[PDB]
Structures are given as structure tokens and as C-alpha cells.
Write a protein that binds this ligand. Structure first.
Ligand code: YG1
Ligand code: YG1
Ligand code: ADP
Ligand code: ADP
Ligand code: FBP
Ligand code: FBP
Ligand code: F6P
Ligand code: F6P
Lengths: 744, 744, 169
């Protein structure tokens, strides 16, 4: 229901971030959905101090066709005048002239501090405007308080209350596009590249893109290199390239410092490599390409959830509420005090200048620390001399999902450095039946991090139909643990082995599932590996289809998407493109709901935005197929719109993985292998079958803020096997957001 | 037929170019198709001077999964040793050890000169190897001559015998991806960007990407700025940004010089803008991102046609033939002397150093001069003070094709600067019936160059069903010329008006069709505007589908594509991805041909490359639909492969246009408007109806090396109206190349 | 019963070679005075070669010699009133079955037991050769394919030879 009768201003300020359009769209649509008047405040605080034509009221269409655009359509100029009270009092006057009483600020820590101040003295700016007679006392008693909601827009991820600032995944798409370029020309010539990235005082972009690209060295200002590091760098660049590699990538944050706090240049790194290794070396100062291009699916969906919460946080705020920032805390949004988050951010800059680099690391966040610890792991790993008793096998099972190759690389390397004879098995459980098992070395898996598909090959085949032959290859190769990376058939596959431990002495084996699928239907995790590539590959395709519909005015597209029975991929894609419906199995729908969605589609063709998009999950309905919706819309729309169908198929499996699927696949491949190796010493060499307990056969997954390992048999009660998906799924709250942004 | 019994070496050398893989693949596949033995010569000339493991024989699979990869899988190291005769004699020894007698070199002007020399003294290197006794006289009488075919691989387009070197369109995709980034962050903040691009001594990349991005200033070493230019730059940056713009882009070639031959830095440009305009300004040295990433469809198809011709040029060469370079000369490949093309390239570097900048311009090529003259036109254009008698109207007709917006922008601006009241009409001929006509200003069309779709809107509606109302809006607005940008309905639309000049006094109006369609089915032109975006949008999608099939081993995909009855889009996409068949209306096919293509698909599943792709044009066959091929392949492949269908639909209309559709759309929009304005003064104000002749209603198009204007009524005999396409189409020779690369 | 030129049946393997052969036989017949064809398709005779697949194939390789159409006989084949044989046979099985039901139901006794636990007490009646047999339902498992819902050998497969001979193979 609506609940307002009041005005919301919105401004984007400071360094622009691709995602600020999806934010101002969702602040506008949620604002006027809930019955407020929304004002776009053009050119940051500079148009707040000018007012006039810089403050004008939005309608539903004033933010149309912006969700796929980078930068910000309202613009984000700096304003030294608002840093002065003489501008700040005029900024108050311009709001109370338009009657604006609530204000959403999309920006970094500086632009949010300026809003915090502008509340803290608001009533005294109103008092001065009464004292000089520009406004009447009744207005100053009405507009007596300002509500701020902060949306943290920044590419740097510089803000300490939050896992992702709006823009930082898209800036990682820009960096990973440039490294997917530079890897091909560096590999052919055997060159080292110094890549410089926009981590101003925050190393997030540098660490995360180093970890996502396999970079041989890294420079972040929260962990400066210890004295004499030029030796250890020239040893590390030597080692990898002696160990059968060819290029090297060196990531340097623009803000990088040494252990004394003095700046280290990309030029000094280039000169050092040339003069101490004789390697042909280049430097790319990758610039404001990082700030631009289309937002990623995560930055559109995130800016939508953040922008919807920011409107709520404004309208439900009180004059005894501290100003709020909307943020992630894992899987879902949380709301935090602006005062605290600014200070906890200033405390990191102060810890870094104070040479307390370990405090700077710990206080950036747990999400910074887990990335840093996994880079610090893989930076320290080697082929060992000592070797160990255990045999491990790695399977791919299901449809191929982007990030399987990252997870296999990280598991093969963590498995080798923990001393194990790691095996890889081609074609999944049909591979383990057919004996397609081979021992793998550190070389054999090099350059897998950036590849789509599966380098092992994968199948849907469940193990019970071949089980007498699967146990016999487990015996013959001496295999003591399985790591299975894959979808629901990886889960039901490892379950069909625990359900068979009582029947066969060889299935007393340590088992881990990494949930790798497009569909997000594996039980246990809240995110499957490859589902971020899938929403991005579908979101890119629906943008092309919407631009087609917008030129061919009065089209409505029906677009089919590969969710299985699981509506995740259709739901998050529908948000990421502003689809007018997404039809999903987890919602009941019928011809009444369809006829309602068609009469809404009809009423929209009176507007300037004479296009429609509806998404259909491939199994959303038993009889209302994509051709049924095509016929229905074509008929009841005849004389107002025509209609077309696309089926996105195996396009949605994507090409190269996203930055999130490269980090997440690498991080699950190590956390899974550390658990596999831990559990495999929690069972003993004498008088026993190893690991018979249900505690030894698990699925790894991101559950809330960090990972959980869930027993495969414990998950049966959270699972629907008939529809191949979990029984409650966190994202069903996002369907409400889809419908609100779609003008229900 | 095969015709060899002899060996071909292939090496890629000097600066790597994305496209060298598609070249070495096509040199390998054509070489072993025609019955030669092919050797890959790893790491450029450095592995030619080493030999040993650097020279190993290819098979059909040794170049599999490389066509979509950038850089070069054989690698391209520099070799100062081959610049010495002591290395050059060992390079001869290593070839005659393996018996290699023909050598394909993929590289720039230096790496090709080294091959020219290595023939010119070959028999004397063979003589020295006999004189020291490493080889017998019979071998030196056998291997007594070396054949070189040069493939010009380079991003710079530095080579004077050719319109496109292999790599230069993909390097423009890399630059236009970076400007499509930087435009969003420069637009939001209102910033000027200095972009530096890899034009080493050649300004092609700088000019072409400046023209394709709407850049406000340009620095190319073949046309240095005249004295005091800092005034004229600060006036031009002032003018556009006073004329309602917001950002500016400045393109500088890395090789840029002033009128005295002394180098101009991107830093000096940044400092100048800041100090003389006070605009917030940045510099992006866009680096070796330009050398990397996946090749564009043009660089895959080009490297395939070039690579196929290079194998022919080797096997049909003689010891009294001068060494050859394979090149474009417009629409098709030509073969030129290596000596002449090297010297005509050295003559440009010499003309540029000799301060003969107009010779350097003329001698780069006619393709350099037409781009430069159109940049020099649009750089000099303005809104005029004088104004002129004529009213012009611009229509979009058909499905929306990427580059329509570029062509409208360039026509609106050329029309305004020639003094005309230009009108734009929304929804095509249904727009001109419904009076959806509006006068347009210089501001109103700004930022259209990079957009997909159509900002006017477009329809399939032909004018005869509304003609009594179309003539009445032509009368009411006083319209004296139509420019129609669009597909076959633009052509048949303008034809239905010339067929009606005898019936209505108002259709005595000057008419031009710019052929803008995805399908390449408009008669007259050999390339339609948007067809390069379409092959790229389909080629990107078939790469995702092939990587899906390659992980899900033993898939065969049937992929349907939007050609209409015209097989262009399916044919050029099938080459660009190495599809195993493309089914096309212009070829007869039946169940015998299908069963043959399925038993070829079966035999491939014994190899390591256990995937298939077949393309189907949407109307290639009346009864053998995509579901028919799915059923057929699924059945006769059961027990060896499974099979899936995708229909690429309106995905193929693309997002943003390619660099070629931005240049070509801009260039046709001006050449068409210059012809429209020329013809419109070739008809006189007194005692007449204007322009009744068939010479006044034409289609513009690239025909061979440059444009032709063809009368719409003269084209009836070259047109099949039932299938909506021309009766002979240049690209049917490319179907032979498709089948050869597909292992027929 | 209608002299069809092919009948496509699951119990026969067939593929595009057999289909292309049946189409070139269908082509050669259009030179005669009898310029018509009929091919029957069982609804599940093939997994991928549906009735629309045969329609497309025949329409194509027959273009210039014949055109082609599809009918799906559905619940028409359940018929109206039964034939004389289904009225006799239904009446005769209803009595022979009830005489066996009543015979067996006295072959089991009122005291100290559960009646009729034996596999001899749960049967299918049917005309087997010259007259009826009663076959135990569990004894029939080995004569049955449950996946395709039919018996594993069926007497009438010899009639397919007669069909092909009368159809000019
Ligand atoms: C570098 C890096 O980690 N990037 C990255 C990328 C994508 C994700 C990441 C992190 O993390 C968590 C998270 C929360 C939500 C989330 C929370 C509330 C509501 C919706 C969503 C969502 C979503 C779909 C995006 C991709 O399917 N989505 N995601 C996914
Ligand atoms: C910056 C720039 O101009 N790039 C550019 C891009 C694309 C084209 C360009 C130029 O020019 C001419 C040409 C020749 C052939 C050609 C010649 C022989 C054989 C095949 C082809 C082809 C093709 C299809 C490519 C895009 O449909 N294709 N093309 C198209
Ligand atoms: N202490 C402050 N008081 C008032 N305004 C401030 C203060 N600090 C920053 N600002 C405002 O924030 C705006 C943008 O902040 P800036 O540092 O430019 O980007 P970011 O939002 O990334 O920090 C500045 O133009 C200024 O108006
Ligand atoms: N005059 C020459 N004689 C022999 N070899 C040459 C000559 N000029 C260049 N080369 C060879 O060409 C190779 C690559 O040329 P280079 O200039 O590096 O790249 P490009 O092919 O772009 O010019 C050099 O490694 C060198 O072996
Ligand atoms: O949903 P699942 O069973 O995990 O499989 C995921 C893949 O399977 C699909 O449904 C398609 O499967 P196929 O490749 O076998 O046709 C897609 O949704 C997805 O790519
Ligand atoms: O081949 P044409 O008639 O020029 O039209 C081009 C467009 O039309 C299509 O066939 C589809 O048309 P619709 O948009 O009307 O369905 C595509 O091949 C292409 O995008
Ligand atoms: O782009 P400018 O104005 O140099 O600002 C620099 C900083 O701003 C940011 O783009 C965003 O906060 C940083 O990444 C970058 O280092
Ligand atoms: O990349 P390097 O080795 O600096 O070579 C520079 C030159 O080589 C090229 O990449 C290609 O010939 C030029 O674009 C570039 O200016």
C-alpha cells in the first residue's frame, strides 16, 4: 500500500558509478509507487545549491530506459560551495521552496558526510531563512527536519559498513574485460603486464581482480610489501614462469604504498622487473574505463533493492532516528547508522596512515579479509616435496556452469599443496563408471580460471545405474575423497552414494559438493557457481531484445529462460531489465493473471514507452507455454501492440565467467579442499572403514555472511526432488520488487 | 580437388593481432584440404632460427577451438638473429631439414620484408649448407626455391596495398568498447577525455575511431595541425559544448606529430585544454587492450578468406613469380607483389618525415582519404546563418538496424549545414501517412551515433495503401526530397513512389535509399548498414553455444538465424564460428544432403572435438524446419551424439553498432545527403514538376572499392521481389570456404 | 484392411533410409493410374519421427509428383456400437470368466484360513489358440514388457510381411 503525502529528493554525487541509474530509477519508482512526490536534483550538490531548473519532479517515465545505462542521467558534479555554510543554507532554501522534506543521496563517504551534516544543523538553516524572511514560520515548523537515506555509490568499495558499494561489481567487469584482453597479447609474446586499477585508498578492486585473474603479484595499501620484497617478487615471477607459465599479470592499486607509507608507482614495478628479471614488460594504466559501460546484473539488482529500501528508510524515519545507510550484509540488505559507517571508514584511513596495516585489513571487513586470506593462501602455495597418503577425485556433474573451471583449478592446487594425489574424472559419474580418471599436475590446470564450460566435461548421469562399476574405480585408483562440482545431479549423486554406504564398503569416502549450476536450484547454498554469469548473459540479451522492441515501436516480447522448475534466473533477470512480468513456477498463475498482465501491457502503449517484455521460465507452467503467451498477447493486444517470442537457450550458460564466478569458484575450490583435507584426517588408518558418518558428505555454500557445510542427507527435508530444487528459497521476496518496478 | 604433395610452413611474427588464429586455422585447413603437409612454426622467426620442437606438423585438430581466441596460439616473438645472415642461414637449414618449401608469414611490413629477403637469397643459403656438408646436393636442387605468401597481420592498418590488415577491425572494437565506457562517465561529470590509441606511425585507428565516436578533435601523423591550432581547438571544444553538448572526446594517435614533425603528447593536450578552457579533463592511455580479446566477425571471415588465398598463392606460385601479399581491394580479395607493397609503405613513412603530409594522406590509400575527407567535412560543418529553399524528410523503414541512427545523425547535420529544413518522420511510411513529421535541429540528433535500434521508429508498411495521404503530407510540409534509411521495404517503398510519379504530381520528389538492414537483402549495395552488427551479434552467441556444446561433450546444435530468404547472415556467421553446415535458401538441399551432413557429424565424434554446430536460415527450406533438423540429427546420431536447438531472434539486431556500422552509417548519411543536395539543384524552380526522371530516385551503396548510386527502377531486373532479395549476390563464393573449413 | 503403402510400428525398427525408400516407392506409383498413397503411423512408433516429420519428408521428396496431408484418427477408433465379434466375444468371456470365478471361489474353504492366497487364483482369461486359456497374472510377468505396456512376443508380427507384399515391396 501507499503511505506518503510527502516529497523525496534524490541526487547522485561525487565519483560516478555504473549502477546509479538503476538506483535513481528504483528510488523514483518506489517513491511514486508509495505515493510520494519524487524530485531529481541534477548535478549533485551543485544543483542543490543552485536549485531552480536543477530541481524538477519525476514521473514513472522520467527514469525510463536508464537501468542499462552507466554513469548517471542526473549527473554528479562536485560542489565546494556545499562544503561552506553559505552554500549549505541555500541548499536548505531550495529544498523547502519545492517542499522537499526527505533526501536520498547516492554517493561515497564524502558525499554522505555532507548529508549527515545537513541534517545535524538543518533546523538552524531553516531558522536563518525565517530570520531574513525568505520563508514563513509555518513552513519552518513543517519542513523542520530532513531525512537522509544514504545509498553508497562508488567503484572502490571504500565503505566499511558494506560488502558491495553500488558500482564495484561493474568496475570488476570492466577490469576483467581488460585482463581478458591483455592475457591474449601477453600470452602470445610471453610478456609481463603491470595493470594499474582505481583503488584510491581502498585495495578492493585490486585484490578482487588479482584473485579473479590469477595475478602473480598484488599491491594493496592495506597490506604493503615487507622490506626487501623486490627479491621475493622476482622469485615469484621467476617461479610461475619456470613452472610452465608464459605471461605474468601484476595488479597495482593506484593508491599503493610501501611498508613506510611512501607511494609505489607502476613505473617503478616495470623498471624493477626489466632490470632484475630481463622479462619483456609493459604498463597499462587502465583508467576511467572502470567507471563506465553498462552495469552488471548484480549492480542493477542491488541498486534496485538498495533504492527500494532507501525510499522505505526515508518515509519510516523519525526526527529521533539517526540517518541511515542501506547496505549488504551477505544475501540480503541491512540498514546502518550513517555516523557510525563514516567513522568506521575514517578509522581505516587513519589505521593505514598510522602504519597499522593489520588493523586496516581487519577493519575493511570480513569480506575483505576472506578474499585477502585466499589470495595470501594461493600466493604462498607450491607443489610440495614431502607428499601424502591420500587420493582425491574431482568430478563435474550437470550442465556446464561458468566457474566450474575456477573451482577445479583452486581444488587441484589446494589439493596438490596439501600433498594429495588429485585425480580429475571426465564426464562426471559416467566418467567414474567408465574409468575416465587421470592424475593431474600443477601445469595441467593452468589458465582454467577464465574459461566457460567445463574442461573435465560433465553429464546428467546419476551414479546408481553404474554403481557396481563406480565402486570398482574408487577401489582401483584408491580414491579416499570425492569433490563434485555441479548442479542438482551432483547433490542427488553424492546422496545416492550416502544412501548406498550401507550397501558398499567403498562409499565410505569423504564427499563434498560445490554447487555449480546456472539455475540456483542446488539445496544448501543460497548462490550456485555460474548463476551470476547466467543472469548477466540473459540480462545482456534482454537489453538487445528491449532495444529491438523500442525501435520497432509497439512490440511486446515473450522471452523464455533456462531456470528448470526454479524461477531464480527469470526473477533476477526480470529485475535487471525491468521486465513487465516474469512467469515462474513458484508463483501460481492462470488466465486471470495473464489477462491482467495483458491489460496492463495495453495501458502502457498510451505512454511514450511503447514496448513490453515478459520473461517465462521454461517450466513455469504445464500448459501455458511461450507459444500460449504469444497467442494470448497477440490477440488481446491486436490493434494496440504486436508480439514476438525469443527462447534464450544455452546462451545463458555464458562465455567467460563474471568476476563473482571467478572469485567464488576459486574461493569454494579452496574452502572445499581445506574441509576435504581436514575431514580426511578426522578419520583413522586402523581397524575401520573411513568416514561412514553423515558429517562426512556435505555441500559447501554461501549461506548468509559466509559459508556453511551442510550434510547431503540432512538437506533431504529442505529439498523437493520432483521439481529438483529447495523448498524455501531466499529470493522470493525479490518478486515483489519486480512487480513494483513493473507498475503493479 | 587436392593438388600438392608438398609442405607449407606458417608463422605469425611481430606485433600480434587478434585474427592471427583465424588466419593460421584457415592456412592449416586449406593446406591439408588441398593435400599439403602443414607445419606450425612456433614463436615467429625465433623458432624458425631455432627449429627443433619449434617446427611441428599440424593436423585438422591442431588448429581447433582457436578461431574465437585473440593473439596467436603459435606465438610471435621478435628475432634480431633473423635480421642477421647467420640466423637467416639456420632458418633455411631448419626448413629444409623438415622439407618445408612454401612459407606463409602472418605479420606487418617488417616481418614481411624479412620473408622477401629470405627468398631473394634462398639459393645461396642452400649453397652454403651444401658447401659445409649439412645437406646433400639433391636436396638443394629439390628445395631450390622458397615461396612466400604474406598475410598482413597488424592492428595499425599500416600497409599501403590494402584496405584492412588482419586485426584492425577488432582493435576498433576494443577502442569503441573503451569509448562506450568513457562516454558515460565523461557525460555525467561533463569532462573532456584525451584518448591515446596505438597508431604507431599510421593514423588509421585514430581517424576511424574518432569518426566512429564523434570525437571533437583528432591528431593523426599524416595530417598534423597547422600553426596556432591551439586557438582553433579551444574554439572547437568551446563551440560543441556551447551548442548543447556536455563531454568532449579528443583522439590522439601515439605517433602524433605537429606541422614541424616534433611529437605531440596526450599530456600536452590535457594541459592545454585545462589552461585555455578551464574544463575538467582526463587522459586515458588506452594500451594493449587494443591488441587483445576475441576477434570481430570481419577479422575471422577476413582471416579465413585471406588464409585460404595465401595457401593457393603458395601452391600455384613459380620461381619466376614475385612473392605475394593477399589483401582486400573492396568487396573481395586481391593478390599483390610483396616488393611493391613494402616500398609503397616505406614511401609513406618517407613522405611523412619529409613534411609532405598531403602525399602521406593520398598514398595511405583511397580508404584512408574518404574517411579523412568525411572527418574533415563533419569537423568543418556548422548550423548556417544563410538558410536555403529546400525541405527534406528522413524516414526509417523495415526492422531497426544498427547504424540507422548514425546515418540519420550524419544526414541531419549534412542537411542542416547545406542549409535545408530537414524533417524526421516517425514510424516510416505509416508516419508519412499519419503526418508524424517534425523539423529537427543540430541538438535534437546529438549522441545518436552509438545507439542501436531506431530513434525515429520504423515500420514494414509500404506506401501504396496510404498513398493519397502520403502525397498530402509531402504537399503540406512542402517536402522536396526523401531520404529513406532501411531494408527491402525502403527500396520497394521508394519504387512504389517512382511507379506512381505518373499518377501523382507530388511524387516528383528527389529520393535516396540508404540500405539499412540486418539481412543484406537490399538490391544495389553489396553491404547493408547493420549487417556487420548482425554477424557480430550472432557470432558472439554461437561462440557461447559452442562452448556450451564443448563442455556438454557430444552435443550437436541446430541454430536458427534471421536472414529472411537471404542466406548472408547464416553464411558469414558460419565462417566466423566454423559451423559444420549452414542451411541457406540460395543452396538447394534435401534429405540426401542432410543425411550426408549427419554422417559427417557422426564421424567427427570419434575425434577429440566432440561437438557440432549447424546454422539454419529461418526460411532456408519450406518443410525442413529447425525442428525437422533436430529430429533428424537426434535420430541418426542416437548412440553417438545428442542434439539441441536455439533460435537466435532479435538478439541479432544487436546492441550498439560495430565500428564499421558507425563509420559506414555516418559516411552513407553524408554521401547520400551530398547527392540529395546536388540532384536537388540539378532541377529548376520555373514552369515544371521537379525531378520526374529515373536518375533522381536511387539507392546508395558500397559496390566495389567505393560507392555507387543505382536508380530504383533500374534495379528491378537485379531484384527478386517474391523472396525480397537481389538475384545475384557477391558472397555465394564464401559458401565454398565454409564447406572447406567444415571438413567437406 | 485398407491396402496401406506402409504402416510404421514400434515393433519394427525404421529410420530415414526406410522412410526415403518408402517415399521413392510412393513416387514411382504416381506414374500408374492409382495416383494416391496411404501410410499409417502408430502414435508411438518412433520417438522423433512424428506424423509431422513424415508429412514434411513426403511433402518435400514428393514435390513435383504428389502433395501430402495428415489425419490423426483419435478416439474415433474407440468406435460406436461393438462389432458382432466384440458382442459374442464379450458375452462369451463374461460367462467363461464368471464360471471360472465361481469354480475357484469354491476351490477355497470357509475355516481357519485366508482364502485363495495361491498364484493360481489371479488370472487373465483370453482366446489363446482354438479356445480360451486362463493365465496367472504373476506367471505373465516374463511374457510382459511393462515399460512399453505390451507382451514381448505377439502373434500378428507375421502379418507385417503380408502388408508389405500387398503394398508392392
Ligand atoms: C565481486 C563479487 O563478489 N561480486 C558479486 C556478484 C554477484 C553476487 C555477489 C557478489 O554477491 C552476493 C549477492 C547478493 C545478491 C542479492 C541480495 C539481495 C537481492 C538480490 C541479490 C541478487 C542477485 C543476482 C546477481 C547475480 O546472480 N546477489 N549476490 C551475488
Ligand atoms: C572499420 C571498417 O570499415 N570495418 C569493416 C567491417 C566490416 C566490413 C568492412 C569494413 O568492410 C568491407 C568488407 C568486406 C567483407 C568481405 C570480403 C570478402 C569476404 C567476406 C567479407 C565479409 C564479411 C562479413 C563481415 C561483417 O558483415 N566484409 N566487409 C565488411
Ligand atoms: N565535511 C563536509 N561537509 C559538507 N560537504 C562535504 C563534506 N565532505 C564532502 N562534502 C561534499 O561531498 C561532495 C562530493 O564528495 P567527494 O569527496 O567529491 O566524492 P565522494 O562522495 O566519493 O567522497 C563534495 O562536492 C562536497 O560537497
Ligand atoms: N630487413 C630485414 N631483414 C630481415 N629481417 C627483418 C628485416 N626487417 C625486419 N625483419 C624481421 O621481422 C621481424 C618482426 O618485425 P617487427 O618490425 O618486429 O614487426 P612488424 O612485422 O610489425 O614490422 C623481426 O623480428 C625481424 O626478424
Ligand atoms: O537445472 P539443471 O538440471 O541443473 O541443469 C542446468 C541446465 O539444464 C537446462 O535446463 C538445460 O539442460 P540440457 O543441456 O540437458 O538441455 C538449463 O536450465 C541449464 O543450463
Ligand atoms: O529481412 P527484412 O524484411 O529486411 O527484415 C529484417 C528483419 O526482419 C526479420 O526477418 C524479422 O522481422 P519481424 O521483426 O517483423 O519479426 C529479421 O530477419 C530481421 O531483423
Ligand atoms: O576520476 P577522478 O576524478 O580522477 O577520481 C579518481 C577516483 O575516483 C574514483 O573513480 C571513484 O571514487 C576512484 O576510483 C578514482 O581513483
Ligand atoms: O606493443 P609494443 O611492443 O609496444 O608495440 C607497439 C606497437 O605495436 C603495435 O601494437 C602493432 O604493430 C602498435 O599498435 C603499437 O604502437
Amino acid at each position: 500500500a501507499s503511505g506518503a503525502g510527502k516529497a523525496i529528493g534524490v541526487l547522485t554525487s561525487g565519483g560516478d558509478a555504473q549502477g546509479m541509474n538503476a538506483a535513481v530509477r528504483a528510488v523514483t519508482r518506489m517513491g511514486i509507487y508509495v505515493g510520494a512526490k519524487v524530485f531529481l536534483i541534477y548535478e549533485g550538490y551543485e544543483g542543490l545549491v543552485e536549485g531552480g531548473e536543477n530541481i524538477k519532479q519525476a514521473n514513472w517515465l522520467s527514469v525510463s530506459n536508464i537501468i542499462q545505462l552507466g554513469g548517471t542521467i542526473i549527473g554528479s558534479a562536485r560542489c565546494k560551495a556545499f562544503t561552506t555554510r553559505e552554500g549549505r543554507r541555500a541548499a536548505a532554501y531550495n529544498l523547502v521552496q519545492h517542499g522537499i522534506t526527505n533526501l536520498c543521496v547516492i554517493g561515497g563517504d564524502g558525499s554522505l558526510t555532507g548529508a549527515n551534516i545537513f541534517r545535524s544543523e538543518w533546523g538552524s538553516l531553516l531558522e536563518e531563512l525565517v530570520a531574513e524572511g525568505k520563508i514563513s514560520e509555518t513552513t519552518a515548523r513543517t519542513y523542520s527536519h530532513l531525512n537522509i537515506a544514504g545509498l553508497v555509490g562508488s567503484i572502490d568499495n571504500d565503505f566499511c559498513g558494506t560488502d558491495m558499494t553500488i558500482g564495484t561489481d561493474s568496475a570488476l567487469h570492466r577490469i576483467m574485460e581488460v585482463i581478458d584482453a591483455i592475457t591474449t597479447t601477453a600470452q602470445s609474446h610471453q610478456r609481463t603486464f603491470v595493470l594499474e586499477v582505481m583503488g584510491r585508498h581502498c585495495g578492493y578492486l585490486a585484490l578482487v581482480s588479482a584473485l579473479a585473474s590469477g595475478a602473480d603479484w598484488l599491491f594493496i595499501p592495506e597490506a604493503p610489501p615487507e622490506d626487501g620484497w623486490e627479491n621475493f617478487m622476482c622469485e615469484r615471477l621467476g617461479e610461475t614462469r619456470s613452472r610452465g607459465s608464459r605471461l605474468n599479470i601484476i595488479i597495482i592499486a593506484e593508491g599503493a604504498i610501501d611498508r613506510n607509507g611512501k607511494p609505489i608507482s607502476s613505473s617503478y614495478v616495470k623498471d624493477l622487473v626489466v632490470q632484475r628479471l630481463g622479462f619483456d614488460t609493459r604498463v597499462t594504466v587502465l583508467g576511467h574505463v572502470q567507471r563506465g559501460g553498462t552495469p552488471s546484473a548484480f549492480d542493477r539488482i542491488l541498486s534496485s533493492k538498495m533504492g527500494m529500501e532507501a525510499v522505505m528508510a526515508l518515509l519510516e524515519a523519525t526526527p529521533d532516528t539517526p540517518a541511515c545507510v542501506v547496505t549488504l550484509s551477505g544475501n540480503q540488505s541491512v540498514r546502518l547508522p550513517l555516523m557510525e559507517c563514516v567513522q568506521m571508514t575514517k578509522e581505516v584511513q587513519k589505521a593505514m596512515d598510522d602504519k597499522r596495516f593489520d588493523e586496516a585489513t581487519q577493519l575493511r571487513g570480513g569480506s575483505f579479509e576472506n578474499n585477502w586470506n585466499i589470495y595470501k593462501l594461493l600466493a604462498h602455495q607450491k607443489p610440495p616435496k614431502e607428499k601424502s597418503n591420500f587420493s582425491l577425485a574431482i568430478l563435474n556433474v550437470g550442465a556446464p556452469a561458468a566457474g566450474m573451471n575456477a573451482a577445479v583449478r583452486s581444488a587441484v592446487r589446494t589439493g596438490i599443496s596439501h600433498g594429495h594425489t588429485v585425480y580429475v574424472v571426465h564426464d562426471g559419474f559416467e566418467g567414474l563408471a567408465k574409468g575416465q580418471v587421470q592424475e593431474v599436475g600443477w601445469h595441467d590446470v593452468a589458465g582454467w580460471l577464465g574459461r566457460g564450460g567445463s574442461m573435465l566435461g560433465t553429464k546428467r548421469t546419476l551414479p546408481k545405474g553404474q554403481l557396481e562399476s563406480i565402486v570398482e574405480n574408487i577401489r582401483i585408483y584408491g580414491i579416499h575423497a570425492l569433490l563434485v562440482v555441479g548442479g542438482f545431479e551432483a547433490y542427488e549423486g553424492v546422496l545416492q552414494l550416502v544412501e548406498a554406504r550401507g550397501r558398499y564398503e567403498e562409499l565410505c569416502i569423504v564427499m563434498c559438493v560445490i554447487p555449480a549450476t546456472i539455475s540456483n536450484n542446488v539445496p544448501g547454498t543460497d548462490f550456485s557457481l555460474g548463476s551470476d554469469t547466467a543472469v548477466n548473459a540473459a540480462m545482456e540479451s534482454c537489453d538487445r531484445i528491449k532495444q529491438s522492441a523500442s525501435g520497432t515501436k509497439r512490440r511486446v516480447f515473450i522471452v523464455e529462460t533456462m531456470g528448470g522448475y526454479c524461477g531464480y534466473l527469470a526473477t533476477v533477470t526480470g529485475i535487471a531489465v525491468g521486465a513487465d512480468a516474469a512467469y515462474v513456477f513458484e508463483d501460481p498463475f492462470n488466465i486471470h493473471d495473464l489477462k491482467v498482465n495483458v491489460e496492463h501491457m495495453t495501458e502502457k502503449m498510451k505512454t511514450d514507452i511503447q514496448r513490453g517484455l515478459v520473461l517465462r521460465n521454461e517450466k513455469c507452467h504445464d500448459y501455458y507455454t511461450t507459444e500460449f503467451l504469444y497467442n494470448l498477447y497477440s490477440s488481446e493486444g491486436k490493434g494496440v501492440f504486436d508480439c514476438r517470442t525469443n527462447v534464450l537457450g544455452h546462451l545463458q550458460q555464458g562465455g567467460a565467467p563474471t568476476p563473482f564466478d571467478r572469485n567464488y569458484g576459486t574461493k569454494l575450490g579452496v574452502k572445499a579442499m581445506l574441509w576435504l583435507s581436514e575431514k580426511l584426517r578426522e578419520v583413522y588408518r586402523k581397524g575401520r572403514v573411513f568416514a561412514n558418518a553423515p558429517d562426512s558428505a556435505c555441500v559447501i555454500g554461501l549461506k548468509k555472511k559466509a559459508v556453511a557445510f551442510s550434510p547431503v542427507t540432512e538437506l533431504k527435508k529442505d529439498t523437493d526432488f520432483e521439481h529438483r530444487m529447495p523448498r524455501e528459497q531466499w529470493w522470493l521476496s525479490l518478486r515483489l520488487m519486480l512487480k513494483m518496478l513493473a507498475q503493479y
